Amino acid sequence: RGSFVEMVDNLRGKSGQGYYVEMTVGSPPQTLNILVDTGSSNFAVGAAPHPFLHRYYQRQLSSTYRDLRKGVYVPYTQGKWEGELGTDLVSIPHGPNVTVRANIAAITESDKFFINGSNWEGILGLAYAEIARPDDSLEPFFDSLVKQTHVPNLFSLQLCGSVGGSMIIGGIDHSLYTGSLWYTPIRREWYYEVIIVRVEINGQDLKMDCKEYNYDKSIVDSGTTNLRLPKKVFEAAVASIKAASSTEKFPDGFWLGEQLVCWQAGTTPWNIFPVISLYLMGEVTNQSFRITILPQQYLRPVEDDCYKFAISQSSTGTVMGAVIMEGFYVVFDRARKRIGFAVSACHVHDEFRTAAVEGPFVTLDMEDCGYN
Ligand SMILES: C[C@@]1(c2cc(NC(=O)c3ccc(Cl)cn3)ccc2F)C[C@@H]2C[C@@H]2C(N)=N1
């Protein structure tokens, strides 16, 4: 507990392509790089020679594979994947020294799913069975892990945003954060659902009814780049962000993520851009805490130094993607139905401002903030 030197730095990735961990499937073990995704619940791997893939799961080579004789078609708003379900033995080489029999969707056909030029070949959905496809009877990887081993029911993520970080499976590594962890309840075990109770731009409250902030849910999701905000909250937030930075002018298309903005190298004016704070429901009645991120988190480098504005409007509720998570060490404390936040020891900041996790604050009617 508290120290897992072998799992430190077990995450890799490239800007814009997410964070992946090395996994092995089958016997003899086939090594695959697998996207870490707290926003879905399927363990799904390329199983056929798609041209974007460095490698793929060759079921025929594994003696331990078992067919479930069942398919699954998974559409997303963007693209889709289809696959054949089965189980096989799975390990994480830079994780616990264990091997589990896990469900695997062997992806046979996909569209707008794999990233051309990425170094990952599947996805590890770390959320709950409730959102598993085709249904909640398909046991997610982490459930199998905890059922079959002595690994404690929790994991933590340090996303450092070329990119890298750590996934600590079964515990917490105190070297990965500074100060104290603050916990928010997991409202319901499907996505990692939480409740935002107040939002500030540069310490200035949006003063929206807090139900708007969670319309229709707020989740913590490592498989999404942006901080996504419900439309109505997004509108107020940009309005306030534009004002806080009106010292400079940018095309309206920029704020809508329709064009990049660029500066002469080493001259990105971080200081004109405001901090963004989310107050989250605390563990105690009428107690909250807040997390603060910098323009370093929401202004994403793209490759002048060109940046994309990564706060975007949503119709699926608030998504705390990599923009939020890169600022923090995040503990998915499944055993206690709570999520912990602490300032990440690796987060990008400057000499004037850092990410922050602060509490306690007194916040009333926090239960009214959840959409039903
Ligand atoms: C499974 C899903 C998903 C995530 C990804 N994620 C990424 O490509 C990605 C890119 C950059 C980052 Cl920082 C994280 N993830 C790709 C495909 C995909 F289907 C679908 C919906 C996007 C939601 C999610 N978390 N996972």
Ligand code: NA
């Ligand atoms: Na166990």
Ligand code: NA
């Ligand atoms: Na620490």
